[PDB]
Structure 1
Amino acid sequence: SKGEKLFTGVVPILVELDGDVNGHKFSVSGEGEGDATYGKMSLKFICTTGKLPVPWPTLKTTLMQCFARYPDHMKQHDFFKSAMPEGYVQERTIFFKDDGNYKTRAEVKFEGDTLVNRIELKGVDFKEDGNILGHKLEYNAISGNANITADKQKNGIKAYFTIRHDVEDGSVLLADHYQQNTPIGDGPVLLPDNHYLSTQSKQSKDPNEKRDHMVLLEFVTAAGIPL
């Protein structure tokens, strides 16, 4: 596969999310640019249905690991680009400690020159007055590692990690992520040795934007296999 060549330049991004969390229905769209050479994404997301009924930080991981920078010595481990342009399915369960869970299914693929991330999210068993539906989580940066392993059975990958969300009382809300990806096309893909993706995130607001929204600058770097 030559999916990697699709990412040497700056790539426009389009994101669409339809969500239902305890019957609160909402939609999110996003736009921006990926520059995988530098592991970079710059993005702006908007709630198109009014007020987001969950905190923006709980949606960050759901809302494109194809833009990670794989160092040259690790290029043979980049499943995410190998699947393009036909794309991959990305499925998670996210278990929020002592609260509900999200189930997500996304298709990530090229539509012409645009990289499109289309997502359905279903959340169940949330506490209507807990830290999520109660909007009690810090709006600050989620950085850290996503652990990747081959799923030779499905010809894709699994991933796993725990996100640590700060709560506004000084406590921490743990979100355990379980991830499966599979190629959409039947062409060959790269099945990796164990490694991780390291994400550095800066989150911000646009002072001219009236819609409920989130601005993100992300840098993502493949690591864990030495030179």
Structure 2
Amino acid sequence: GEELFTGVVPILIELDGDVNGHKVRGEGEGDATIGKLSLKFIATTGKLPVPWPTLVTTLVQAFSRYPDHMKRHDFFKSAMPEGYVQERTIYFKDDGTYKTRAEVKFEGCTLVNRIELKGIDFKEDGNILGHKLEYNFNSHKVYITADKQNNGIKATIRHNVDGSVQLADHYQQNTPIGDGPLPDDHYLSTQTILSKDLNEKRDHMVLLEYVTAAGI
């Protein structure tokens, strides 16, 4: 299923999120060849209650560069084009929690991951509901390990805040939807940049990401 990831692929991302009773559409393209994502996300509903950094990780691991020596270690591509389910529970230290279910599939000459998010237990005038996070991101390593039992995968994000840091504990689970592949323990190193179209009246985020794999 890596065949599908030779060259450029169109991307659809739709998130249905509910944070403390407060109820994003993204388009662009991804190059598994370069681990390069270019995406613009659109809130639609109104002024988002959470900052733009919290939602990103919740915003396509299959587009990551697994080097040629690491080919047989690509869970994400192997369930193609039938796809995966990605569930995460995300504990923000000293704050609330996201609980996320995602489906990552081809529904095209074009990919899609359609996602529900339910955020509960966030404190008002906390760092999250108060939008005290900077419009930026740090680099991270993605420690991946196999799950013979669930036939899939499992896997602390630093959000820059007034100079403090909010950590966000990520517990992730990935299950194939067809009958696909598992690889040994490995790590994904990331970079993401936030930007904005100053022509855009609505609340938005332009995203550029670079992710390559390493570890054995």
TM-score, scaled relative to structure 1: 0.94
CA distance in 1, matches of 2:146, 2:28: 30
In the alignment, which of 84, 91, 95 is matched to residue 88 of structure 1? Answer: 84
Cα drift, residue 203 of structure 1: 1.1
CA distance in 2, matches of 1:196, 1:100: 27
Q: Does 1:199 align with 2:197?
A: no
One-letter identity of the residue aligned with 2:98: Y
Deviating beyond 6 angstroms after TM superposition, the runs of 4 or more aligned structure 1 residues are none
CA distance in 2, matches of 1:83, 1:145: 23
Matches within 5 A, 1:64-143: 64-143=60-139
Cα drift, residue 111 of structure 1: 0.7
One-letter identity of the residue aligned with 1:224: G
Q: Does 1:178 align with 2:171?
A: yes
Q: Does 1:219 align with 2:210?
A: yes
Cα drift, residue 113 of structure 1: 1.5
Is contact 2:137-2:160 (8 Å) kept? Answer: no
* Alignment partner, residue 37 of structure 2: 41
Matches within 5 A, 1:140-159: 140-159=136-155
Fraction of identical pairs, as percent? 85
Aligned residues: 216
CA distance in 1, matches of 2:90, 2:3: 32
Cα drift, residue 141 of structure 1: 2.3
**Secondary structure in 1 aligned to 2:41?**
strand
TM-score, scaled relative to structure 2: 0.98
- The RMSD of aligned alpha carbons is 0.7
One-letter identity of the residue aligned with 2:212: T
Cα drift, residue 117 of structure 1: 1.0
In the alignment, which of 23, 43, 47 is matched to residue 21 of structure 2? Answer: 23
One-letter identity of the residue aligned with 2:184: D
